[PDB]
Coordinates of C-alpha atoms and ligand atoms in Angstrom, one line a residue:
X1 CA 0.0 0.0 0.0
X2 CA 3.1 2.2 0.3
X3 CA 4.5 4.4 -2.4
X4 CA 8.2 4.0 -2.6
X5 CA 10.8 5.7 -4.8
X6 CA 14.2 4.0 -4.6
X7 CA 17.4 5.1 -6.4
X8 CA 20.9 3.8 -6.9
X9 CA 23.8 6.2 -7.3
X10 CA 24.4 7.2 -10.9
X11 CA 27.4 5.5 -12.4
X12 CA 30.0 7.8 -13.9
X13 CA 29.7 7.8 -17.8
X14 CA 33.4 7.3 -18.5
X15 CA 33.9 4.0 -16.7
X16 CA 32.8 0.5 -17.3
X17 CA 30.5 -1.1 -14.7
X18 CA 32.6 -3.2 -12.3
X19 CA 32.0 -5.5 -9.3
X20 CA 31.9 -2.4 -7.0
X21 CA 28.9 -1.0 -8.9
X22 CA 27.3 -4.4 -8.9
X23 CA 27.3 -4.6 -5.1
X24 CA 25.3 -1.4 -4.9
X25 CA 22.8 -2.2 -7.7
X26 CA 22.3 -5.7 -6.5
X27 CA 21.7 -4.7 -2.9
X28 CA 19.1 -2.2 -4.1
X29 CA 17.5 -4.6 -6.5
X30 CA 17.1 -7.3 -3.9
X31 CA 15.3 -4.8 -1.6
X32 CA 13.2 -3.5 -4.4
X33 CA 12.1 -6.9 -5.5
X34 CA 11.1 -7.8 -2.0
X35 CA 9.1 -4.6 -1.6
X36 CA 7.2 -5.4 -4.8
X37 CA 6.5 -8.9 -3.5
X38 CA 4.8 -7.3 -0.5
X39 CA 2.4 -5.4 -2.8
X40 CA 3.8 -1.9 -2.6
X41 CA 3.9 0.6 -5.4
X42 CA 7.7 0.8 -6.2
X43 CA 9.6 3.0 -8.5
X44 CA 13.3 1.9 -8.9
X45 CA 15.1 4.8 -10.5
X46 CA 18.7 5.4 -11.8
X47 CA 20.6 7.3 -14.5
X48 CA 24.1 7.7 -15.9
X49 CA 26.1 10.7 -14.5
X50 CA 27.3 12.3 -17.7
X51 CA 28.6 15.8 -17.1
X52 CA 32.0 17.3 -16.3
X53 CA 35.4 18.3 -17.5
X54 CA 36.8 14.7 -17.7
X55 CA 34.0 13.7 -20.0
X56 CA 34.4 16.8 -22.1
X57 CA 38.1 16.1 -22.6
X58 CA 37.6 12.4 -23.2
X59 CA 35.1 13.1 -26.0
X60 CA 37.6 15.6 -27.6
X61 CA 40.3 12.9 -27.5
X62 CA 38.0 10.4 -29.1
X63 CA 37.0 12.8 -31.8
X64 CA 33.3 12.5 -31.2
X65 CA 30.7 14.7 -29.6
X66 CA 30.2 14.2 -25.8
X67 CA 26.5 13.4 -26.6
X68 CA 27.6 10.5 -28.8
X69 CA 30.1 9.2 -26.2
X70 CA 27.8 9.3 -23.2
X71 CA 25.1 7.7 -25.3
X72 CA 27.4 4.7 -26.1
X73 CA 28.6 4.5 -22.5
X74 CA 25.0 4.6 -21.2
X75 CA 24.0 1.7 -23.5
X76 CA 27.0 -0.3 -22.3
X77 CA 26.0 0.3 -18.7
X78 CA 22.4 -0.7 -19.2
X79 CA 23.4 -3.9 -21.1
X80 CA 25.5 -4.9 -18.1
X81 CA 22.8 -4.1 -15.5
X82 CA 20.2 -5.9 -17.6
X83 CA 22.5 -8.9 -17.6
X84 CA 22.3 -8.9 -13.8
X85 CA 18.6 -8.4 -13.9
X86 CA 18.6 -5.1 -12.1
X87 CA 14.9 -4.2 -12.4
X88 CA 14.9 -0.4 -12.9
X89 CA 11.6 1.2 -13.8
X90 CA 13.6 3.9 -15.5
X91 CA 17.3 4.5 -16.4
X92 CA 17.8 8.0 -17.7
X93 CA 20.7 10.5 -18.0
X94 CA 21.8 13.5 -16.0
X95 CA 22.2 15.0 -19.5
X96 CA 18.5 15.4 -20.2
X97 CA 15.8 18.1 -20.6
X98 CA 14.2 17.0 -17.4
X99 CA 17.4 17.5 -15.4
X100 CA 18.1 20.7 -17.2
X101 CA 14.7 22.2 -16.2
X102 CA 14.9 20.8 -12.7
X103 CA 18.4 22.0 -12.1
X104 CA 17.5 25.5 -13.4
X105 CA 14.4 25.5 -11.2
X106 CA 16.2 24.4 -8.0
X107 CA 19.0 26.9 -8.6
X108 CA 16.4 29.7 -9.2
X109 CA 14.6 28.9 -6.0
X110 CA 17.8 28.7 -4.0
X111 CA 18.9 32.0 -5.4
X112 CA 15.5 33.6 -4.7
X113 CA 15.7 32.3 -1.1
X114 CA 19.1 33.9 -0.6
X115 CA 21.2 30.7 -0.5
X116 CA 23.5 31.6 -3.5
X117 CA 26.6 33.7 -3.0
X118 CA 29.1 35.2 -5.5
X119 CA 32.8 35.2 -4.8
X120 CA 35.9 35.5 -6.9
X121 CA 38.5 32.7 -6.6
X122 CA 42.0 32.1 -8.0
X123 CA 42.7 28.8 -9.9
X124 CA 45.3 27.3 -12.2
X125 CA 44.4 28.1 -15.8
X126 CA 45.9 26.7 -19.1
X127 CA 46.3 29.7 -21.3
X128 CA 47.0 27.6 -24.4
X129 CA 44.0 25.3 -24.3
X130 CA 42.1 28.2 -22.7
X131 CA 40.5 26.5 -19.7
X132 CA 40.7 26.2 -15.9
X133 CA 42.3 23.0 -14.7
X134 CA 40.9 20.7 -12.0
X135 CA 43.7 19.5 -9.7
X136 CA 44.3 16.2 -11.4
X137 CA 44.8 17.9 -14.8
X138 CA 47.9 19.6 -13.5
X139 CA 51.2 17.7 -13.3
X140 CA 54.7 18.6 -12.3
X141 CA 57.6 18.1 -9.9
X142 CA 56.9 17.3 -6.3
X143 CA 58.0 20.3 -4.2
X144 CA 59.3 18.0 -1.4
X145 CA 61.2 15.1 -3.0
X146 CA 61.5 16.7 -6.4
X147 CA 60.2 13.6 -8.2
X148 CA 58.9 14.5 -11.7
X149 CA 55.6 13.9 -13.4
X150 CA 53.4 13.9 -10.3
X151 CA 49.7 14.6 -10.7
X152 CA 47.4 16.7 -8.7
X153 CA 47.6 17.3 -4.9
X154 CA 49.8 14.4 -4.0
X155 CA 53.2 12.7 -4.8
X156 CA 53.1 9.0 -5.5
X157 CA 56.8 8.6 -4.6
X158 CA 57.2 10.3 -1.2
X159 CA 53.5 10.5 -0.3
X160 CA 53.5 14.2 0.3
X161 CA 50.3 16.2 -0.1
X162 CA 50.0 19.8 -1.3
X163 CA 48.1 22.2 -3.4
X164 CA 48.9 21.8 -7.1
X165 CA 50.0 25.4 -7.0
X166 CA 53.1 24.1 -5.1
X167 CA 54.2 21.8 -8.0
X168 CA 57.5 22.8 -9.5
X169 CA 57.5 23.5 -13.2
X170 CA 53.7 22.8 -13.5
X171 CA 52.4 21.5 -16.8
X172 CA 48.8 21.2 -18.2
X173 CA 47.9 17.6 -18.5
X174 CA 45.8 18.7 -21.5
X175 CA 48.2 20.7 -23.6
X176 CA 51.6 20.6 -21.8
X177 CA 51.5 24.4 -21.4
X178 CA 52.6 26.1 -18.2
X179 CA 49.4 27.0 -16.2
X180 CA 49.1 30.3 -14.3
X181 CA 46.7 31.5 -11.6
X182 CA 43.7 33.3 -12.9
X183 CA 40.6 34.9 -11.2
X184 CA 37.1 33.8 -11.8
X185 CA 33.7 34.6 -10.3
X186 CA 32.0 31.5 -8.8
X187 CA 28.6 30.8 -7.3
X188 CA 28.3 29.2 -3.9
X189 CA 25.5 27.3 -2.2
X190 CA 25.1 28.3 1.4
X191 CA 25.2 24.9 3.0
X192 CA 26.0 26.4 6.5
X193 CA 22.5 27.9 6.6
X194 CA 21.1 24.4 6.9
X195 CA 23.4 23.2 9.7
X196 CA 20.7 23.0 12.4
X197 CA 18.3 21.2 10.1
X198 CA 21.0 18.7 9.1
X199 CA 22.1 18.1 12.7
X200 CA 18.5 17.4 13.7
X201 CA 18.2 14.9 10.9
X202 CA 21.5 13.2 12.0
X203 CA 20.2 12.6 15.5
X204 CA 16.7 11.6 14.5
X205 CA 17.8 7.9 14.4
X206 CA 16.8 7.2 10.8
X207 CA 20.3 7.1 9.4
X208 CA 22.7 4.2 10.0
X209 CA 24.7 4.6 13.3
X210 CA 28.0 4.6 11.4
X211 CA 26.8 7.3 9.0
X212 CA 25.5 9.5 11.8
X213 CA 29.0 9.3 13.5
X214 CA 30.7 10.3 10.3
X215 CA 28.4 13.2 9.9
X216 CA 29.2 14.5 13.4
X217 CA 32.8 14.6 12.3
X218 CA 31.8 16.8 9.4
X219 CA 29.8 19.1 11.7
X220 CA 32.8 19.4 14.0
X221 CA 35.1 20.3 11.2
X222 CA 32.5 22.9 10.1
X223 CA 30.3 23.1 7.1
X224 CA 31.5 25.5 4.3
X225 CA 29.8 27.2 1.4
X226 CA 29.9 25.0 -1.7
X227 CA 31.4 26.1 -5.0
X228 CA 28.7 25.0 -7.5
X229 CA 29.8 26.7 -10.7
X230 CA 32.4 25.9 -13.4
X231 CA 33.6 28.0 -16.2
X232 CA 33.3 27.3 -19.9
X233 CA 34.5 25.3 -21.8
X234 CA 32.4 22.6 -20.0
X235 CA 30.0 19.8 -20.8
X236 CA 26.9 20.4 -18.7
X237 CA 24.1 22.9 -18.0
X238 CA 24.8 26.6 -18.5
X239 CA 23.7 28.8 -15.6
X240 CA 20.8 31.2 -16.3
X241 CA 21.8 34.9 -16.5
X242 CA 25.4 33.9 -16.2
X243 CA 27.0 33.6 -19.7
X244 CA 30.0 31.3 -19.7
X245 CA 29.1 29.8 -16.4
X246 CA 27.9 26.2 -15.8
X247 CA 26.5 24.2 -12.9
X248 CA 29.2 21.9 -11.4
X249 CA 28.4 18.3 -12.2
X250 CA 27.8 17.4 -8.6
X251 CA 25.0 20.0 -8.3
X252 CA 23.1 18.5 -11.2
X253 CA 23.9 14.8 -10.5
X254 CA 21.4 14.1 -7.7
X255 CA 18.8 16.3 -9.4
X256 CA 19.3 13.9 -12.3
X257 CA 17.5 11.2 -10.2
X258 CA 14.6 13.5 -9.8
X259 CA 14.8 14.1 -13.5
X260 CA 14.8 10.3 -14.2
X261 CA 11.5 10.1 -12.3
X262 CA 10.0 13.0 -14.1
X263 CA 11.0 11.3 -17.4
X264 CA 9.3 8.1 -16.2
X265 CA 6.1 9.9 -15.3
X266 CA 6.0 11.9 -18.6
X267 CA 6.6 8.8 -20.7
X268 CA 3.7 7.1 -18.8
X269 CA 1.5 10.1 -19.4
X270 CA 1.2 10.3 -15.6
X271 CA 0.6 14.0 -14.7
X272 CA 0.2 13.5 -10.9
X273 CA 2.9 11.2 -9.5
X274 CA 5.9 13.5 -9.8
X275 CA 4.4 16.1 -7.4
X276 CA 2.9 13.3 -5.2
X277 CA 6.4 12.0 -4.7
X278 CA 8.4 15.2 -4.5
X279 CA 6.2 17.9 -3.0
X280 CA 6.9 18.9 0.7
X281 CA 3.6 17.2 1.9
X282 CA 4.4 13.9 0.2
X283 CA 3.3 10.7 2.0
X284 CA 5.5 8.7 -0.4
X285 CA 8.8 7.3 0.8
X286 CA 12.2 8.2 -0.8
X287 CA 15.3 6.1 -0.4
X288 CA 18.8 6.4 -1.8
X289 CA 21.2 3.4 -1.9
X290 CA 24.7 4.8 -2.0
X291 CA 28.4 4.1 -1.2
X292 CA 30.5 5.7 1.5
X293 CA 32.4 7.9 -0.9
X294 CA 29.4 10.1 -1.8
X295 CA 27.7 10.3 1.6
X296 CA 28.8 13.9 2.1
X297 CA 27.0 14.9 -1.1
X298 CA 23.8 13.0 -0.5
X299 CA 23.5 13.5 3.3
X300 CA 24.5 17.2 3.5
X301 CA 24.3 19.1 0.1
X302 CA 21.3 17.2 -1.2
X303 CA 18.9 17.5 1.7
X304 CA 19.8 21.2 2.0
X305 CA 19.3 21.8 -1.7
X306 CA 15.8 20.1 -1.5
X307 CA 14.9 22.1 1.6
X308 CA 15.9 25.4 0.0
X309 CA 13.9 24.7 -3.1
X310 CA 10.7 23.6 -1.4
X311 CA 11.0 19.8 -2.2
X312 CA 10.7 16.9 0.2
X313 CA 13.9 15.3 1.6
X314 CA 15.0 11.6 1.7
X315 CA 13.2 9.3 4.0
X316 CA 16.5 7.6 4.5
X317 CA 19.9 6.9 3.1
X318 CA 21.1 3.2 2.8
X319 CA 24.9 3.2 2.7
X320 CA 27.1 0.2 1.8
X321 CA 30.8 -0.4 2.1
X322 CA 33.5 -1.0 -0.5
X323 CA 33.9 -4.3 -2.4
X324 CA 37.1 -6.2 -2.0
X325 CA 38.2 -9.3 -3.8
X326 CA 40.2 -11.9 -1.9
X327 CA 40.4 -9.5 1.0
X328 CA 41.9 -6.5 -0.7
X329 CA 40.9 -3.6 -2.9
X330 CA 40.5 -4.7 -6.5
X331 CA 43.9 -5.0 -8.3
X332 CA 44.3 -4.8 -12.0
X333 CA 47.7 -6.5 -11.9
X334 CA 46.2 -9.4 -10.0
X335 CA 43.2 -9.6 -12.3
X336 CA 40.8 -8.8 -9.5
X337 CA 39.5 -5.6 -11.0
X338 CA 36.6 -7.4 -12.6
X339 CA 34.1 -5.8 -15.0
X340 CA 30.5 -6.7 -14.9
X341 CA 30.6 -7.6 -18.6
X342 CA 33.6 -9.9 -18.0
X343 CA 31.9 -11.6 -15.0
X344 CA 28.9 -12.7 -17.2
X345 CA 31.2 -14.5 -19.7
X346 CA 32.3 -16.8 -16.8
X347 CA 29.4 -17.0 -14.3
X348 CA 25.7 -16.3 -14.2
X349 CA 24.2 -13.2 -12.5
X350 CA 22.5 -15.3 -9.7
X351 CA 25.8 -16.6 -8.4
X352 CA 27.1 -13.1 -7.6
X353 CA 23.7 -11.9 -6.4
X354 CA 23.6 -14.7 -3.9
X355 CA 27.1 -14.3 -2.7
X356 CA 26.8 -10.6 -2.1
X357 CA 23.4 -11.0 -0.4
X358 CA 24.8 -13.7 1.9
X359 CA 27.5 -11.2 3.0
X360 CA 25.4 -8.0 3.2
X361 CA 24.1 -6.4 6.3
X362 CA 22.6 -3.1 7.5
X363 CA 26.0 -1.8 8.3
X364 CA 28.5 0.1 6.1
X365 CA 31.4 -2.4 6.5
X366 CA 33.2 -3.6 3.4
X367 CA 32.0 -6.7 1.5
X368 CA 34.6 -9.3 0.5
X369 CA 34.2 -11.5 -2.6
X370 CA 36.7 -14.3 -1.7
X371 CA 36.8 -16.3 -4.9
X372 CA 37.6 -19.7 -3.3
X373 CA 34.7 -19.2 -0.9
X374 CA 32.5 -18.1 -3.8
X375 CA 32.9 -21.5 -5.4
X376 CA 32.4 -23.4 -2.1
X377 CA 29.4 -21.3 -1.0
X378 CA 27.5 -21.3 -4.3
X379 CA 27.9 -25.1 -4.7
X380 CA 27.1 -25.8 -1.1
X381 CA 24.0 -23.5 -0.7
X382 CA 22.5 -23.2 -4.1
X383 CA 23.3 -26.5 -5.7
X384 CA 23.4 -28.7 -2.6
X385 CA 20.9 -27.2 -0.2
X386 CA 18.2 -25.4 -2.2
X387 CA 18.2 -26.8 -5.7
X388 CA 18.9 -30.2 -4.3
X389 CA 15.4 -30.4 -2.8
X390 CA 13.9 -30.2 -6.3
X391 CA 16.6 -32.2 -8.2
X392 CA 16.5 -35.2 -5.9
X393 CA 12.7 -35.4 -5.9
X394 CA 11.4 -34.3 -9.3
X395 CA 12.6 -37.4 -11.1
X396 CA 10.5 -39.8 -9.2
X397 CA 7.5 -37.6 -9.5
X398 CA 7.8 -37.3 -13.2
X399 CA 8.8 -40.9 -14.0
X400 CA 6.5 -42.8 -11.5
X401 CA 3.6 -40.5 -10.8
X402 CA 3.0 -38.7 -14.1
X403 CA 4.3 -35.5 -12.7
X404 CA 1.5 -35.2 -10.1
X405 CA 2.2 -34.2 -6.5
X406 CA 0.6 -35.9 -3.6
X407 CA -2.9 -35.0 -2.4
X408 CA -1.8 -34.0 1.1
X409 CA 1.3 -32.9 2.9
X410 CA 3.3 -35.8 4.4
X411 CA 4.5 -33.7 7.3
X412 CA 2.2 -30.7 7.9
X413 CA 4.1 -29.8 11.1
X414 CA 7.4 -29.4 9.2
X415 CA 5.7 -27.3 6.5
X416 CA 4.3 -25.0 9.2
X417 CA 7.8 -24.5 10.6
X418 CA 8.7 -23.3 7.1
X419 CA 5.8 -20.9 6.6
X420 CA 6.0 -19.6 10.2
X421 CA 9.5 -18.3 9.3
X422 CA 8.1 -15.8 6.7
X423 CA 7.7 -13.0 9.3
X424 CA 11.3 -13.0 10.5
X425 CA 12.7 -13.5 7.0
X426 CA 10.6 -10.8 5.5
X427 CA 11.7 -8.5 8.4
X428 CA 15.3 -9.3 7.5
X429 CA 14.8 -8.4 3.9
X430 CA 13.0 -5.2 5.0
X431 CA 15.7 -4.1 7.4
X432 CA 18.4 -4.9 4.8
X433 CA 19.8 -7.6 7.1
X434 CA 20.4 -9.8 4.1
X435 CA 23.0 -12.0 5.8
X436 CA 20.5 -12.8 8.5
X437 CA 17.8 -13.6 5.9
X438 CA 20.1 -16.0 4.0
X439 CA 21.2 -17.7 7.2
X440 CA 17.6 -18.2 8.2
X441 CA 16.7 -19.6 4.8
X442 CA 19.7 -22.0 4.7
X443 CA 18.8 -23.2 8.2
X444 CA 15.4 -24.2 6.8
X445 CA 17.1 -25.8 3.8
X446 CA 19.2 -27.9 6.2
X447 CA 16.0 -29.1 8.0
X448 CA 14.4 -29.9 4.6
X449 CA 17.4 -32.0 3.5
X450 CA 17.4 -33.6 7.0
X451 CA 13.8 -34.6 6.4
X452 CA 14.6 -36.1 3.0
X453 CA 17.5 -38.1 4.5
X454 CA 15.2 -39.3 7.3
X455 CA 12.7 -40.6 4.7
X456 CA 15.5 -42.0 2.5
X457 CA 13.6 -41.9 -0.8
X458 CA 16.5 -43.8 -2.5
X459 CA 15.6 -46.7 -0.3
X460 CA 11.9 -46.4 -0.5
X461 CA 12.0 -46.3 -4.3
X462 CA 13.4 -49.9 -4.6
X463 CA 11.0 -51.4 -2.1
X464 CA 7.8 -53.3 -3.2
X465 CA 4.5 -51.6 -2.6
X466 CA 5.9 -48.3 -1.3
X467 CA 4.8 -46.2 -4.3
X468 CA 2.5 -44.0 -2.1
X469 CA 5.3 -43.4 0.4
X470 CA 7.7 -42.3 -2.3
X471 CA 5.2 -39.9 -3.9
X472 CA 4.5 -38.5 -0.4
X473 CA 8.1 -38.0 0.5
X474 CA 9.1 -36.4 -2.9
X475 CA 6.1 -34.2 -3.0
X476 CA 6.9 -33.0 0.5
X477 CA 10.4 -32.1 -0.5
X478 CA 9.2 -30.2 -3.5
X479 CA 6.8 -28.2 -1.4
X480 CA 9.6 -27.2 0.9
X481 CA 11.5 -26.1 -2.2
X482 CA 8.6 -24.0 -3.2
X483 CA 8.7 -22.1 0.1
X484 CA 12.5 -21.6 0.0
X485 CA 12.5 -20.3 -3.5
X486 CA 9.8 -17.8 -2.5
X487 CA 12.0 -16.5 0.3
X488 CA 14.9 -16.3 -2.2
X489 CA 12.9 -14.8 -5.1
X490 CA 14.2 -11.3 -4.5
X491 CA 17.8 -12.7 -4.7
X492 CA 17.8 -15.2 -7.6
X493 CA 15.6 -13.9 -10.5
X494 CA 16.6 -16.4 -13.1
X495 CA 16.6 -19.5 -10.9
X496 CA 13.2 -18.3 -9.7
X497 CA 11.9 -18.2 -13.3
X498 CA 13.2 -21.8 -13.9
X499 CA 11.6 -22.9 -10.6
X500 CA 8.3 -21.3 -11.4
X501 CA 8.3 -23.1 -14.8
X502 CA 9.0 -26.4 -13.1
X503 CA 6.3 -25.8 -10.4
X504 CA 3.8 -24.4 -12.9
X505 CA 3.1 -21.5 -10.6
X506 CA 4.2 -18.0 -10.0
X507 CA 5.7 -17.7 -6.5
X508 CA 4.1 -15.1 -4.3
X509 CA 4.9 -14.2 -0.7
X510 CA 1.4 -15.1 0.6
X511 CA 1.1 -18.1 -1.8
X512 CA 3.2 -20.4 0.5
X513 CA 0.2 -20.6 2.8
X514 CA -1.4 -23.0 0.3
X515 CA 0.9 -25.9 -0.6
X516 CA 0.9 -27.5 -4.0
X517 CA -1.4 -30.6 -3.8
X518 CA -2.7 -32.9 -6.5
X519 CA -0.7 -30.5 -8.7
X520 CA 1.1 -31.2 -12.0
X521 CA 4.8 -30.2 -12.2
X522 CA 7.0 -30.1 -15.4
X523 CA 10.3 -31.9 -16.1
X524 CA 13.5 -29.8 -16.3
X525 CA 17.1 -30.0 -17.6
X526 CA 19.3 -28.8 -14.7
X527 CA 18.1 -25.9 -12.5
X528 CA 21.6 -25.0 -11.5
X529 CA 25.0 -26.4 -12.2
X530 CA 28.2 -26.6 -10.1
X531 CA 31.0 -24.1 -10.6
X532 CA 34.8 -24.6 -10.0
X533 CA 38.1 -22.9 -9.4
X534 CA 39.1 -23.5 -13.0
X535 CA 36.4 -21.0 -14.0
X536 CA 37.6 -18.6 -11.3
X537 CA 41.1 -18.8 -12.6
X538 CA 39.8 -18.1 -16.1
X539 CA 37.9 -15.0 -14.9
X540 CA 41.0 -13.7 -13.2
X541 CA 43.2 -14.3 -16.3
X542 CA 40.7 -12.6 -18.5
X543 CA 40.7 -9.5 -16.2
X544 CA 44.4 -9.0 -16.2
Ligands
ZN1 ZN1 57.4 13.7 -3.5

């Protein structure tokens, strides 16, 4: 009965989707699919973050328009996400008419309300190319150790940190020309004006404890005005009444999520939902799934921007940690920097979805993809615990009972134990305690396989006159499978479809209350195959 708008952070246009992105999008998709299973109105929204100096320069180097480049990158991203069955209701772009109009609108309102300030700043400028240079586009000699060709505000040889203005014999990364300091008028958003409001939100208890603690650190350091303008040349939205000035990509980026929803409503011919979800008096819920590196933008700048422009603010922020492979940050040299597209050439989407889900919690701690454990866990849990319940029992039903399940449950008590667990498992999905949900589900799977072993169908099947017993035992196992697959439906989309085809029924959350009796099931190839380390080794080699 709830109206929920859920978003995932917008992937940067100039970068292929990797395992890190997948952790975020999979976490959100699992939650979204569960919400849909409970009958709520859900709108899963995302978009490609396509503006900025890096993108502008990349396009120039490739000899194509930025529009063409971001378009191709967007399609690549969507192909990968579709491959992992991320169920977005809309995937738009921050470079859109919807975002242009909403960004101009919000800026206008913020300015009218007195939250925009003008101040001149001094910044390194490339006089040859004719453009201001972001820190990483300035290279030179470290002022401390004198090591050459160091980029931005830090030296990769001695570890020193400094302003790029301290680099010796500075050079433009773009043209090689010597940059010089140049003045420029910039527009600033008065974030400090929203300090009390933001502090109240931080202590409200809605945000994750770890996030609230980090925010207190930021309040202690002190909030500062935010530089939201960038000079031409730039690829983005030009600021109204300010020729040659553009909105910094980070200002328009989150607005792009609002833009993606407007685009969805407009395509649907829905003239009421946008305001119903974004107006101050909205009763709809708004959630953002994000990573630790952008919490400052989404927890401070964003809510303040919305408040200052008369829009509702996030109901909550769901933050996840970094992804590690084999315990460490992804390493290109070790072949652990894995792209989503590469992953799919070696394994299916469900395997990664399951593994991440089994490790995820409501905290922001890092998630580790240990490849050896990946093979062991997928084979042990999916193939040997869950799918086993169907694969060990379906054959007998199809070959000896014409594919028809027993007329009654052989062990009603055991079945109730399984259906009684729906409350706790659903609450775990709801609270984002994915690890807890999976542990509860696998505990049930253990009891199910214990039941089959206690009945020993491989023994019953060879004994004279025990046909009824065999059908009863195998049908019972298949019904336990039905329940487990329902609980795992948000996690394993493809296996679920194969399971529903086998069971001749769509799996619904409430449906488990009525077991399948005197019901016809269909035969199947292999619901899920084992994986091995040879495949992992191939994945790693292909990623080097
Ligand atoms: Zn140095």
